[PDB]
Each structure stands twice: as C-alpha cells, then as structure tokens.
Amino acid sequence: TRRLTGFLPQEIKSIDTMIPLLSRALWNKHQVKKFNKAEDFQDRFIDHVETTLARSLYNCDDMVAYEAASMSIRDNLVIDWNKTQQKFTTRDPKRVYYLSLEFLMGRALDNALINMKIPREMIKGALDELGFKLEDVLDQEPDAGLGNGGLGRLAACFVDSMATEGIPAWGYGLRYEYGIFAQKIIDGYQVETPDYWLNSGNPWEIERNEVQIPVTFYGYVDRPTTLSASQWIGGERVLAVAYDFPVPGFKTSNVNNLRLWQARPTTEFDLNKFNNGDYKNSVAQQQRAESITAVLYPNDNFAQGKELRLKQQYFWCAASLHDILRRFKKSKRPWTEFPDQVAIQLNDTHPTLAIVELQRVLVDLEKLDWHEAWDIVTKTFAYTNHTVMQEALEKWPRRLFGHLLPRHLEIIYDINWFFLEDVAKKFPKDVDLLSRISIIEENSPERQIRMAFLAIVGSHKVNGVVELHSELIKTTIFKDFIKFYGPSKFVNVTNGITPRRWLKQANPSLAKLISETLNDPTEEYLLDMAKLTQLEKYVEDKEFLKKWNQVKLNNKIRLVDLIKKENDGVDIINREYLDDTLFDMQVKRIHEYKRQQLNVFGIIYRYLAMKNMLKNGASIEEVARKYPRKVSIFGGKSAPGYYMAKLIIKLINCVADIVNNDESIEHLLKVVFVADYNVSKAEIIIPASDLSEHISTAGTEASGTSNMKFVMNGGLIIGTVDGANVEITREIGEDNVFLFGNLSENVEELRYNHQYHPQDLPSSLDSVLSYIEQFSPENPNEFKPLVDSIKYHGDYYLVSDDFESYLATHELVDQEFHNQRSEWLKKSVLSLANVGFFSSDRCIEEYSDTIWNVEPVT
Amino acid sequence: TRRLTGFLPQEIKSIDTMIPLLSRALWNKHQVKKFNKAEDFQDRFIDHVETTLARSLYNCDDMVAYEAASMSIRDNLVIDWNKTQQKFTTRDPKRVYYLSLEFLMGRALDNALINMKIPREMIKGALDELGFKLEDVLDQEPDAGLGNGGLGRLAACFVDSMATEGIPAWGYGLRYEYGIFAQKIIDGYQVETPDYWLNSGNPWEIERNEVQIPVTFYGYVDRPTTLSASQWIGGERVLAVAYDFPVPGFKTSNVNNLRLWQARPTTEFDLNKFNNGDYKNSVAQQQRAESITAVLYPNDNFAQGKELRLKQQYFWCAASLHDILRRFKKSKRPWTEFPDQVAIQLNDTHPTLAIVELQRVLVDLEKLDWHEAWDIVTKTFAYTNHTVMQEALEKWPRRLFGHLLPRHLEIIYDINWFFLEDVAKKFPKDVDLLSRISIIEENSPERQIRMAFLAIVGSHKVNGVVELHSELIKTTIFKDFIKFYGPSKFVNVTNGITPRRWLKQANPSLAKLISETLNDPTEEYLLDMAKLTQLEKYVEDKEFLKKWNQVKLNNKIRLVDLIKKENDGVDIINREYLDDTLFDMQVKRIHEYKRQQLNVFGIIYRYLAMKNMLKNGASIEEVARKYPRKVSIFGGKSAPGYYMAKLIIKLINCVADIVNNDESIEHLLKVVFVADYNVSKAEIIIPASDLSEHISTAGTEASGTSNMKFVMNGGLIIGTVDGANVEITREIGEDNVFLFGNLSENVEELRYNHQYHPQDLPSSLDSVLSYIEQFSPENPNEFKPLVDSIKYHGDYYLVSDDFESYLATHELVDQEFHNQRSEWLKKSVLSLANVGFFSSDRCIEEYSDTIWNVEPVT
Ligand SMILES: *Cc1c(COP(=O)(O)O)cnc(C)c1O
Ligand SMILES: *Cc1c(COP(=O)(O)O)cnc(C)c1O
C-alpha cells in the first residue's frame, strides 16, 4: 500500500514472500499488456465506448471516439510510466527537476501516437475500420491551457527531449483551470474569454488524490537571530493535490512525468454557516483556495494581483520542493549527498522562492547548520535567464513579501548579509559595488528584493538562451556578479525545438520526403538531426525541387482550409494561383517592440502604391508585375490592458476589410488574422509558410524559438539582426536569410537623434501615416495614438528608420519567390539541411553534460 | 451524429446503407461485448489501471481499483443503456417521466454488480485474483449527494423498479455539487460541511456536454389578455447541462436513465473584468449560475433564498420539460397525442411549475389554443402528494413569483379564472367556495399562489402515498377539489422500496438464505416478492430460525465494525454479547415532530432508571434483567437553523457521553450517533436492525419508506399508528408490529387541552426534564428550550401524551427480543414473508396501470 511511484528494491524482496503463490499467479496471468497489434487497440477502444462511456456503435460520435481512444492510449502509457518510475527508484540516479511556471503542452493524442514503441498508421488503420477518421477525432482535443508564450513552449520541448533521452526528469507546474484566457476577435477587437479546456474532464491526467501537500501563508515566526531553527506559525493553509501527466519519448519506452498542482481548501464546506443562511460564506474558503490555480499570469497591476502572483509562485515552489525532498528521504541517504542526487533548474525567475524554501526546511525542520544547508542549496540550483532589458527583471516589495512570507524574508536578509560580507572581503572599500550587487534594493520608499540577484547567489550555474544573449548578460545586467563569481558560473545553451512535434507531427508530408530521399524508413534522422545535411546533395536536381515544392503547396492548402473553416465555410484566400501566392506570416505576441505595426505599415504602403498605379492607367498585368500575389497572415494575442497592442489588432482587421474586399486589385493582396493562435494552429500555420517575419527592433530579443520552427519546415526569414536570427544565419548561411534594418549599435544613437536632433519621416511612411489619420470611417481618428507615437514621441522602436530597408528587402523577396523559384527552393532545402543544431535534444545534451551532470538511466 | 439516445428506425434503415461494408464489418468485429466471463472483467480492469489511471500493479491501490472497476462496469452498462434507449425509440411506447427534486441514489457500484445479466461473484472472483478485495474497493465510493430524505429515496427506488420492469421511464433532477450538506458532529454539535461527493470525479455519469438547455429568469411579458401567445423577454439565462446516470434493472438488460442537470453560466469567464483588475466580478456570472445547483434545499428563510428555491425549481422544471418535449417531437406525432405518449409524474409540489410551463410552451411557443393546450396539460400530469398538514403546502408570494416568473404568473391567473368559472357554474352562488378553492390566495398583504391547488387543477390524477393519506387529502386539504372534480381523480398508490438494494444488496446473507430455502437459485423472488410468503411454512422450524438469526448477527457485526472504524479504531459497542444486544435504531431527520426527543427522553429515562437502580443496590444482573443490553443507534441530520433540532443532536451526544462512559452500567446501554447518515450507512444500519423507531406524533406522517426497509430485513417496528405503519400493519399483520401512542382523532383535542385546560406532565418525563435542566456541566441550562416547549408551551407534539405508552411498548420489545427470540424471529420471518407488497415493483405496476396507462417495452 502507500507508494505510487516505486518500491525500494528491499521492500519488494520482503513483501513478495508473504503474498500467497496463487494470488501472485492470478495477478500475473491477468496483468495488462501493451498493444502489440491494431486488434488490441480496437478491443480497448470498443470496451471503453461500451463500458466507460456507456455508449454503442449507434451513438459513438467523434467526441466519444476521442474520449475512448485517449483513454486507451493513456492505459498503454500508464504501464510504461509505472515501469520507468520503478526503474529510477530501483536505480537511484541523479534526477533533474525542471520548474516552470508554464508548460505549453498543446494537444497530447497525436504526439502519443508518434512516440509509441511496439505508430500512427496502425492506430489510423484500426480507427478507420471502426468508422473513424483519425483527423476528425484528433480535432476534438482542447489544447492544454497550461502555458502561454515561448517560455512555456521551451519547457514543453525540453520535457519531450528529456523523455526521449531517458534522462530522469520531472517537470513541476500548476494546473490552471482556465488557461491565461482565450481570444475571440469581436468586431475587429480582441475580447478575452475563459479558456475552458477542462470542460469534459481530461483523459490524459492521473489525479493523485493521495498526494496532498499543505502550504502556508501569512503568520509569524516565533523563535521565542534568524540563523537558528525558528518556528513559522502561519495564518492560512491551503492544499496542493497533484495531477500526473505521463510524457512519452521517441522510440524509448521511458515515460517521464509532469506533476501539476491544483489548490484546494482545507475546509471545503462549512455547514454551520450554510445552516445559518450565510450561504456565501459557507463556501468562502473554497473560493479563496481556488484563486491560486484558477488563471495563469493573474493581473498584478494592483496590490491584490501582486499578492496573488507571489502567493501562486510560493504554492508551486513549496509543494514541488516538498515532493522533491520526500522522494529523497526514501533513499535514506545523508543530506550531504542531496547535490549529488537532485538537480533543480529554474526556468526563469518565477521559481526563485524554491531556493529560500530549501534553505528554510533544511534549517527549520531538518535542523542543519545554516552554513551547511546553504552549501547544499547552492550546489542544487541552476538558473536559465531569458531577459535582456534590466527593467523586465522581477522584484518584490518588502512589506508585501514580508507579510505574506515572514520567515522567507528573514532568510533573504541573512543570505544577502553573508553574500555582501564575501563581496567586501573580495573588494575592500568598493562602497558602491555593495549597493549595486545587493539582493535588497534600497529604494524610495519601498525596498525591493531583487529576485534575479537572489537566483544568481543561490545557483551554481546561470545560463543565457543564445550565445549573444549570454555574452550580453555577462556584459550588462550581471556584470558585477561576473566580477565576484568569475565567468565560469555564466554559461550559454542556445534554445531549440523538438523535431517530433515541429517536423514529424506538423509536417508529415515533408517527413516522408526526407525518409524517402535519404532512405531512412525508421525516421532515425529525428534522433540524429545531423544527417539532414545530406539533403544538400540533392539541391541541384529538378525532380527533388519539384517534390519539395509540392509538399509546401499541399501544406498551404491545409492552412487555406483552416481559414475557410474559421470563416464559416467562406474562403478568404483565392485558391486558384496558390503556387504563385507568397504566404507571408507574423504569428506571435502582439507587442509594439515586435513591430507588427512596421509590418502593417508596409502592407498599407504596398496597397496604396498598387491602387495609385491602377488609377494612373497601368493594367493589372503591370501592377501585378511590380507587386505580385501575396497573403499576409497575422496571429497572436495582446495582453488585456495593453491599449496600443489592442489598437494594432484592430488596425490589422481594418486593413484586411478594405484590401480583401477591393475588387480593383483583383486578389493580388489579402490580409488574414487567425484568432486564438495556440500550438495546434501553429502546427498548421508554420509548415505552410513561404516567408515568416522576425522583425523586432534590434537588440530586443534574447532567442526566439518559432523562428527555428519556420526554418525546420523550409520557410524563409525576413528579420532583424537580433535574437535567434543571428544563430539561424550562422548555421544555415547568410545567403539564405533576408536581413535588414539597423543593428544594435546604432539603436541608442538613432533613438537619441529622434528626440534631441530630429530628422523627418520618409515620404513612404508619411503616406501611410496620413492615410490612416486604413480609412476607419466610423471613427476617423481611432488610430491616432499609434501615428503620434512615431510622428511625435521619438519613435522609440525605430519604425521610421527601418521602413525603407524593410520595403527594399520585400522587393527582393518578391522577385526571388515569384520569378526565380529554383533559387527560392534551394534556400528552403538548405534551411532544412542545416536546421539540426536547433533540435531540443542537443539543448538537453548540453544541459545534462555541463550543468546537471546527469546521465540517462534507460 | 447528434442523437444520443436513439435513432428513429427509419433513420437507421436509411443510414445503414451508406456505411461501407468494411467499416460496418470492422466496427462489427470490434464492437464491444459485454463481459461474459471473469477474464473479461479482468482485462477491462487491468487496462483501466494501466491506461486510464496510468498506474501499475505496484501502485494500484483501492481508490485506484474502484475507479477502474467502476469504469469497467459503467462500460458494460453503457452497452445496454444504449440498446434500451434505442428500443424505446424504435418502439415508441408511452413513456413515464418522473420529476423529482431529489433522488437519493446512494452508491452505484454494487447495485450494478447485482443488476448485471450475463454477478457479484464473478466480479468478486476476478478482483480477488488481481489483488483486490471487492469490499475494500466498494468503500471508496462517495454516496451521490443528489437527494436527502425519503422523497428522494422514493424516487430512487422507483427508478430501479421501472428499470427492472422494462417500463419506459426517465427521471429528471438536479446534480447538486455539494449535496445538501454533510454532517460532522464536532463537539457533539452538528456542524454542517460541504458534501464533497464529486471530489475525485464520478465514474458513473455520462456527462452529456451535448445536452445544454437555456433557462430564463426575470424579465417581462410583452404581448404587446393573457390567453394569447405572449412573449417572455426574460432578464437572466443560465444553462442546464445534462448528466446521465444509467439505471440497471434486475435480470433485464433494460437500462433506463436518470438525467440530472447542472447549472452553468452563459458566460464562464469575463476577461474584460479580469483584465481591469476586477477579478471578483470577472467570474461573477459563474458564481450566480452555480448557485442554482450548488446546494440542495437552499436556505429560503429570507428573500434571497425564497428566490433561489423558486429559481432552482423553475430551472429543473424548465430543462426537463424541454427535454421531454424534444424527445416527443422526434415522434412527429400530433400534440393531441401527447397525453397518449407522455406521462409526467410530479413527485410532490416542487415540479408544479412544469404544468404552467407545459401550458406556457404549448400556448406561447407551440401556439395551441389556450383551451386545447390546457386539455393536454391536464391529461399529461399527475401529482403525487406527500403532504399532510396544509401549512407545508407550497405557496409563493405574487410579488416574488411575478418578478422572477412574469408569464407564468399570467397563466396562473388565467388557469385560476376559468377554474373558478367552472366552479361557479357547478355551484351557483357559492361565494366562499370560490375564495377557498382558488389558486390565488388573497392574503394580507402578499397574495400567494397556492402551488398544490395549481397542481390539482393541472393534473388528471392526484394520488396520495398511502391509502389513509389519500383518504385524508380527499377529506381535508383538497375537499373542495373533490367536490368539483369528483373522487375519481384522487387515487392512492402506497409507496414501497426496491428489493435489490434494500434486500439483496444490503443483506446478501439473507438473500442467500431465501434462495437456499425456497430453492430459488435464480433469486426469482426479487422479481416476485409474492413468493416470499412460502417462508411462512418454514417459520415453524428451528434450523431455519437459527439460520435467520445468524444472518442478523453477522449483520450486526458489520454495523459494529462501522462504528469502530468511525471511532478511530475504538469500539463503542461491546462485541462480546452482541447476539443479545438489541439494536434499536431511529435513523431519520431530526425534527421535533419525528420525536427523536421522545426517544432520547426515553433513553435518559431508562438510564436514570438504571443508575438509580444500581445505586439502590441492584446487581447488574438485576438491572440488566429489567433493562437489557441495548444500543440505541441514532442517525440523521437537522436542518441548519432548526435550533431545537440541533439541540436534540447535542442532547443525544451528551447522553452518549455520559452513558457510554459510565462504567457502572457495564455496557448495558450504549447510545451511538452515526454521523452523516446517508444510504450506505443505511444499508449497513438497516439489516443490522433489531428494532427501528417510527414514532412521530399521530397524524403527521404520510407514508414512510425506511419503515418498509426495516421490514424487508426482518427488523421490527415500534411506531405510532400513523404513516406507513398502518399499511405495514395491514400486510404483515398487527401482531408483528409494536404500535403505541395516540391516534389522530385524539390529537386535536389533546393539543387543546394542553393549553386551555392543562393537565400535568407524567413524572417519568418530569424526571428526565429536570435531569437535563443529561447534565451538561459546562452550560447547565443549555437544554432549556426543549424542556420549556413541553413544559410551558402546550407540548404541541404530544411527547407528554405518548411518553408512557412509548415506554410501555419498549418494555414489550425488550422482553420479546431477549427472552423469546423464537417468537421474535417468527415476527421477523413473517415480516419478510409479507413485506412483498411494499416492493416498489408493485408501486410501479399500479402507477403504470391506473395512472400512467403504460405497458413495459422489453
Ligand atoms: C513556438 C511557439 C511559441 C514561441 O514562439 P516565440 O518565437 O517565442 O514567439 C509561442 N506560442 C506558440 C503557440 C508556439 O508554437
Ligand atoms: C430510506 C431512506 C430514507 C427515507 O426514509 P424516511 O422513512 O422517509 O425517513 C431517507 N434517507 C435514507 C438514507 C434512506 O435510506
């Protein structure tokens, strides 16, 4: 009884003898086996329809089929999830715990079908014989509302690669009920909605009602000097109940685990209250508890949200560390071996409280010496940093932090004290250094606790996400920490993406082409991306290029089908002429620095130029020869209160309404916006891409994984020389990317000249800003804040500066693609051929060998 | 696609031809079959552990096993739920819809094991081979928090019988999240707690996320004379989502359905609000919606609750009628045939709005003539009335009703108008009749709508729950209605209980005995309870009686085991001597008229008598000879604000603390209170019963089904000549029940004399009232209101009057049981032998033949 993920070997050798031989024989002659053949899947599927779902052939529809098929696949997974967890218990290897505030998991079923050792075609077969089109049942699955942007997607890809590599890793996070939110574009505006992804339960979790951790907030420390084992007599306690998500690996039978926490009240219902008619309060406790896992990134733009964000980050750090030390004590190993057995990765600053908490439990509960405990903490953590600009670094104010977490404030003051002593002993008399490098920021009037500095001081390794970013954190925001610790502590591991979701799941038709040309029927190239350089040989010969183009044309058709479906059966994109239609997409977070507005100003410019040309008596054959057939695809969500980002979404929608419906330019240009862009939409959108925009102001992006997703699928980049664009260029060659705009050196000066020595706007740009001051007749000055930020508030994101360069590169793109497609297709094949360094398997190799010092146990 | 419970035959003959023969062959070669053998169940079970629950042999504990096994059985059920629903669709028989505000379903697994055509033993076998004790896994199941008292349990039993009989019936109700509440006795007090029965989901439902009915509140009617099709432009809309619970029948493969509604907001999350930091309001709608199915019987003792109760009753009437007319229209039959096809039973007044609603939809939406519609309404409904005292008849105030339901007020005024005309034409010049029989009560200052009168006027049949009740409603509260309608309309169908839960589930050991003795290996007697009269032959012979008693002893052990478990391993009841311990239980709603206080006053009396006896130098052999070993088992819940009922629970607990721990009486008396008495507890508690108390003031109980449950299990009744006691007595014979106390004739006079001509309290009673004015040292006047109600406020429930009679009958009981158990055992065997009329199968036969005019379609 009692232990769900592994019996220590000894326990099993004792227990086994007290079980009567008949029980052991029966259990053994009826133990579940994994599917070995399609019939096996059919039998599980039909039994779940008839028994679980209490349904029959006559009313098992596609939602039923998905529920049943998911239940069958999870059954198979559980068998290997149990074996793997027992192997690690029996073999006690060093383990990796990956703490991330968001895991952008996407949809689980097809990924399980691909990472299945004995196949999508067998299951595909089996389902079709029972009456089901796999693709129709695949669509019934809601994307897990467990993450949001690239931070979470990086945690997701990693989790996959660790499982493929048999690395003993677990991810810990939160089980958000409602996602971050979900986007509807109502009347050209974004309206936020609850992302109801658990409405019909969730067939992939294991709810572990058995694992319930208590977590405490507020209270007081009573000793009756901080260094000593103190007692936190807290004021509120909530419960963390775990939910296990199994994680398959490609070709392994090693299934690793994601453990997410849901917050529950200590007292569900209060009958006293209800019976006295105080109904609202009888359920009050329940309400408070559930706030903590209700929504991702709760609005912290006011005290209550600042509090809830901290409250949530403590709850997950607390419960996860608890579960991480519980498992350790089954080893019965001495605390001094904890660093040799546990590696915890802080994916960004959000889990830094885990440092302060391990110190808190080792000193207050476990009674170690403050200094012996701190040595263990130090050797256990490592921090990945994703921030460029110092302003985005997380700080908490002392009043709030103290009130909510009294003992953890005490330990942060202690930690900082000894660190600042160590600094004083290394740089005698350097007064200002002590102020700058301190964890507590002495500010007016609220002192802050600088979390990123606490994370450097508590970790044995910090790393950036791309080489240039890494150089930059040693050179800029963490310079003093490099002086005191030495360059050694600051590493780089360039980000990457998983081949199985982003190439084999998202683009099967290309995955088959490669397995055909390179003659690799076992898809071994997904484990060894290095082999894709062989595609370079076949760059020179025609039938291959025809083949390569066809894949991309069929992929374009899928996207077109999606836009039609999403437009209630009406097509937006003109399907005839599609092979000569350049699909140009910019799908990412709507934010002024991502410069979606630069891209829109470029669209309006081209449109204005086309229209003017027609009216000056050119035939469309003449206009089309200069501005050929294009579809601009935009997708992404704005934060709920970012007014300017929400304006940019309305503006894209307005441009689309005038241009898409303007007969005169006869379908030479269309603008489309995809709502509630999530991973599944990105799996349809990315393999269809002819060109993808990666145009942020230079110097603003640290890495950038969707860039890599476009490259792995033969898409070309038009981008700024920033972020992941720089490393893409290194690997695939400068001659294959379309770079433009200013470089970072010139950014601070061009910014200065804008205010204290202004030049003027280019006529091109001035034509579009006057033309929107597009048309918007109902409110002919709605788009004014945007125009006036460029035209009157120093144009901080350099739209004016890059406008002409951007347009010049687009003239290039257009001629390349339409008029000399064999040159275009060579850029695409070579992209593929050299994308392999960005495989998240290589990121996990690097992390395992330099930071975690972890070996696979498979 | 789309229809979940049956394809009209035609639809299938058409569809079938379009399915390719290979799909049809595959589907057909992999269609789930029902378990035919234990291996079949093992395979489903292991697969659910490994796959659904992602677990393994090494960590599949009992919660896991239950979850898995439940899932396997539901799977089997679903196969026949689907067949049955399709048969009815194909055969279009008249259907019965049973509307009930509460369905006390209890725990579903074992019931399913028993009502399983090919067995608990096969499953049992199978589980044990895998490592599981059935009984350990059975306990993991929370009792469905879907009902509360007998009203709901009547609906539950019915549902079972209809299913066994192949009667085409569906039950409609609400899916309460939190039950009514759950009771913890903290410090001897009841503390209400949320009944968290859905904490780990619910493996028996089918969540039909597909069936979502809108329901509307407030608003206005706009015509721009009520008679006409009017438009209700309501002000709030909530959603009703169905959850299907399959309902097996014994030996049938006919599985019928319970459809429960959950209220959902029309808008789950409001991102606008959230983003503005108005977090609280962003989720506000959700909050309001969920109020409607959050809790059963919401506290209506203030406007807000009056409102919520009406709100809830409308929601369920509305959604259910909707679902009932929807299914009707698949028949494509004329509205004039609705009465020939739908029979809707109003289980009590709570669904009377269904009348007004069917009239509302037939007139406003379906556009029938007010008078033609009304004729259909009339012929469709029948009302079972469960109320004795007119005061408990539901009325709603016009302001509130009107405000919440404006159109339904209009129709109620109309309905009433014509009815009152009809009355005037039948009784010219009878002025006051018109006032009395009216549906709208002209009162100060708020006019009420008398729901029960509306229900009479809208039904074609009204029925009481027991013959005497029935006569009484014709004679009293509904007399004028009998004058005007004629006796014919007022029927009786005495209530009853299902044999399979209350005998075979709750008491297997007896069910085996009967199958052994009557040589009926097939348990056919559960279908034909009439055969149990054969047990009467075996009344006379010893081995049988030994056998009969053994059963009851083992059953008592079970209860004891329960109380121990519930007392943290500490036993309360002394296990040695158990066969001579009379288990005397009164498990029911704590209410002054149920007279638990009479029973407690009787316990304290006996204790005071015992103690006094000991102190007067009797040896316990002497005390024991007079007051033999008894365990009073109390169980039941008080309403949250019923101060006096809550006092009574403290008082029972106080008594138990003094008596149970009083060494002196050496275990001759124990008082035990079982907290949070639900059905499962009642399935352990009832077969263990030696005697059960049914002691309400005479004239206060309409029927009373636990009484029958006790009878079916050989328990004897001590009761008032009231309620179901009267019919129990008829059937099993007066000589087998212990009746006492005043008769109803005498109640009004005894009551009068209490105030305007008082006699004095019996000394017996005065001893106990002074003794509690038991001990309670901390607050030596806590129990005063109880004492002063009897002693100074006319003792309206006749405790004083019946005290002595009660004690006298107890003396009888005690002697019968301890000293002449063969006579006791004959009462028990004969009880059994003649309990058969109270089989809910016979209730359902009667209902089917007189009221519903329904035939089985099996
Ligand atoms: C790839 C991915 C991301 C990360 O992309 P960024 O370049 O970091 O914007 C975000 N969202 C989705 C849905 C993705 O698939
Ligand atoms: C039988 C039953 C009831 C109905 O009994 P009443 O005699 O009407 O009090 C109520 N609750 C439970 C748990 C039951 O099993």
Instruction: Please provide the DSSP assignment of B447-476 as one string.
Output: -EEEHHHHHHHHEEEEEESSHHHHHHHHHT
* 8 Å CB contact between A499 and A712: yes
Q: How many CA atoms lie within 13 A of B305 on its CB side?
A: 15
Q: Indicate if A461 and A561 belong to the same structural domain.
A: no
Asked if residue A854 belongs to a domain, the reply is no
**CA nearest A256 in B: which residue?**
B54
How does B590-599 read in b/e, with b if 16+ C-beta sit within 10 Å? Answer: bbbbbbbbbb
Bridge-based pairing state of the strands A182-186 and A189-193: antiparallel
Contacts of B23 in chain A (CB under 8 A): 128-131
Q: How far apart are CA A67 and CA A142, in angstroms?
A: 12
Collapsed DSSP state (helix, strand, coil) of residue B32: coil
**CA nearest B246 in A: which residue?**
A54
Nearest residue to B735 (alpha-carbon basis) of B717, B723, B758, B756 = B717
Beta bridge partners of A670: A631
Which residue is catalytic, options B386, B595, B606, B650? B386
Identify the helix (H) or strand (E) that includes residue B692.
strand B691-694
Q: Indicate if B502 and B489 belong to the same structural domain.
A: no
Phi, psi of A26 (to 5 degrees): -60, -50
- Which candidate in A4, A18, A31, A52 is best for mutational testing of the B interface (most B CBs within 10 A)? A52
Q: Indicate if A28 and A148 belong to the same structural domain.
A: yes
Count CB atoms within 10 A of the CB of residue B572. 18
Asked if residue B4 belongs to a domain, the reply is no
Q: How far apart are CA A641 and CA A301, in angstroms?
A: 9
* 8 Å CB contact between A498 and A160: yes
Q: How many CA atoms lie within 13 A of A738 on its CB side?
A: 27
Positive or negative: CA dihedral B777, B781, B787, B791: positive
Q: Tell the burial category of B611 from Cβ atoms under 10 Å away from its Cβ (0-12, 13-18, 19+).
A: middle
Q: Indicate if B261 and B235 belong to the same structural domain.
A: yes
Q: What does the angle CA A528 – CA A533 – CA A534 come to, to the nearest 5 degrees?
A: 100
Q: Is the CB of B535 under 6 A from ligand 2?
A: no
Q: How far apart are CA B60 and CA A71, in angstroms?
A: 17
Collapsed DSSP state (helix, strand, coil) of residue A95: strand
Q: How far is the CA of A48 from the centre of ligand 1 (A)?
A: 35
Q: Do B61 and A298 touch (CB under 8 A)?
A: no
Q: Is A201 in CB contact (< 8 Å) with chain B? A: yes
Task: List Cβ neighbours of B161 (8 Å cut-off, separation of 6 or more).
Answer: B167, B249, B498, B839, B840, B841, B843, B844
Q: Do B63 and A282 touch (CB under 8 A)?
A: no
Helices (H), ranges, B566-668:
596-615, 620-626, 643-659
Asked if residue B399 belongs to a domain, the reply is yes
Instruction: Please provide the DSSP assignment of B367-405 as one string.
Output: ---HHHHHHHHHHHEEEEE---SGGGS-EEEHHHHHHH-
Asked if residue B474 belongs to a domain, the reply is yes
- Which candidate in A5, A16, A75, A210 is best for mutational testing of the B interface (most B CBs within 10 A)? A75
CATH number at residue A818: 3.40.50.2000
Q: Indicate if A482 and A503 belong to the same structural domain.
A: no
Q: How far apart are CA A841 and CA A501, in angstroms?
A: 13
* 8 Å CB contact between B559 and B684: yes
Q: How far is the CA of B69 from the centre of ligand 2 (A)?
A: 28
Radius of gyration of chain A (CA): 29
- Distance (Å) of CA B371 to CA B339, B415, B523: 15, 10, 51
Find the helix packing angle between B38-47 and A38-47, rounded to 10°. 100
Q: Is A301 in CB contact (< 8 Å) with chain B? A: yes
Inter-chain CB pairs, A–B, below 8 Å: 312
Domain count, chain A: 2
What's this structure's resolution in Å?
Answer: 2.8
Q: Indicate if B556 and B434 belong to the same structural domain.
A: no
Asked if residue A796 belongs to a domain, the reply is yes
Q: How far apart are CA B36 and CA B47, in angstroms?
A: 17
Q: How far apart are CA B711 and CA B722, in angstroms?
A: 16
Q: Do A75 and B641 touch (CB under 8 A)?
A: no
**CA nearest B45 in A: which residue?**
A32
Nearest to B54 among A42, A246, A295 (CB): A246
Q: Indicate if B492 and B518 belong to the same structural domain.
A: no
Q: What does the angle CA B669 – CA B670 – CA B672 come to, to the nearest 5 degrees?
A: 155
Q: Indicate if B385 and B342 belong to the same structural domain.
A: yes
Collapsed DSSP state (helix, strand, coil) of residue B261: strand
Q: How far apart are CA A462 and CA B632, in angstroms?
A: 69
Q: Is A284 in CB contact (< 8 Å) with chain B? A: no
Asked if residue B857 belongs to a domain, the reply is no
Positive or negative: CA dihedral A138, A143, A149, A154: negative
Q: Please name the residue whose Cα sits nearest to atom 11 of ligand 1.
A: A149
Q: Indicate if B520 and B432 belong to the same structural domain.
A: no
Instruction: Please provide the DSSP assignment of A216-271 as one string.
Output: EES-EEE---TTS--EEE-SEEEEEEEEEEEEE-SS---EEEEEEEEEE-S-S--H
Question: Any idea which residue has 């299951």 for tokens?
Answer: A123
Helices (H), ranges, B405-542:
406-426, 431-437, 451-458, 467-475, 479-485, 499, 508-517
Mind telling me how many Å the CA of B328 is from chain A's nearest CA? Answer: 19
Q: How far apart are CA B354 and CA B358, in angstroms?
A: 6
Q: What does the angle CA A535 – CA A540 – CA A542 come to, to the nearest 5 degrees?
A: 100
Helix-strand-coil split of chain A, %, nearest 5: 55, 15, 30
Task: List Cβ neighbours of A392 (8 Å cut-off, separation of 6 or more).
Answer: none
Nearest to B640 among A129, A275, A299 (CB): A275
Asked if residue B3 belongs to a domain, the reply is no
Q: Residue A166: left (phi > 0), alpha (psi -120 to 50), or beta? A: left
Q: Indicate if B393 and B485 belong to the same structural domain.
A: yes
Question: What single DSSP character describes residue A209?
Answer: E
Instruction: Please provide the DSSP assignment of B194-254 as one string.
Output: ---TTBTB-TT-EEEEEEEEEEEES-EEE---TTS--EEE-SEEEEEEEEEEEEE-SS---
Q: Indicate if A352 and A371 belong to the same structural domain.
A: yes
Pocket test for ligand 2, best of B679, B700, B717 (most atoms within 8 A of CB): B679
Nearest residue to B77 (alpha-carbon basis) of B229, B244, B216 = B244
Task: List Cβ neighbours of B152 (8 Å cut-off, separation of 6 or more).
Answer: B100, B101, B102, B103, B104, B146
- Distance (Å) of CA A118 to CA A35, A48, A854: 7, 21, 28
- Distance (Å) of CA B342 to CA A578, B167, B315, B839: 58, 12, 20, 24
How does A110-123 read in b/e, with b if 16+ C-beta sit within 10 Å? Answer: bbbbbbbeeeeebb
* 8 Å CB contact between A673 and A635: yes
Whats the size of chain A, residue-wise? Answer: 858
* 8 Å CB contact between A98 and A234: no
Q: How far is the CA of A152 from the centre of ligand 1 (A)?
A: 9
Nearest residue to B54 (alpha-carbon basis) of A85, A319, A64 = A85
Q: Where are the beta strands (DSSP E) in A573-618?
A: 582-587
> Please, what is the end-to-end C-alpha distance for chain B in angstroms?
26
Q: How far apart are CA A524 and CA A531, in angstroms?
A: 9
Phi, psi of B222 (to 5 degrees): -135, 135
Q: Do B54 and A48 touch (CB under 8 A)?
A: no
Nearest to A54 among B61, B78, B200 (CB): B78
Beta bridge partners of B275: none
- The token pair at A590 is 């709507």
Q: How far apart are CA B397 and CA B185, in angstroms?
A: 36
Asked if residue B52 belongs to a domain, the reply is yes
- Distance (Å) of CA A241 to CA A89, A105, A319, B719: 22, 20, 9, 48
Domain that holds residue A31: 24-496+840-845
Q: Is the CB of B818 under 6 A from ligand 2?
A: no
- The token pair at B781 is 């006047």
| Residue type for position B229 | A
Q: Residue B611: left (phi > 0), alpha (psi -120 to 50), or beta? A: alpha
Q: Indicate if A677 and A812 belong to the same structural domain.
A: yes
Question: What single DSSP character describes residue B700?
Answer: -
Q: Widest CA span of chain B, in angstroms?
A: 92
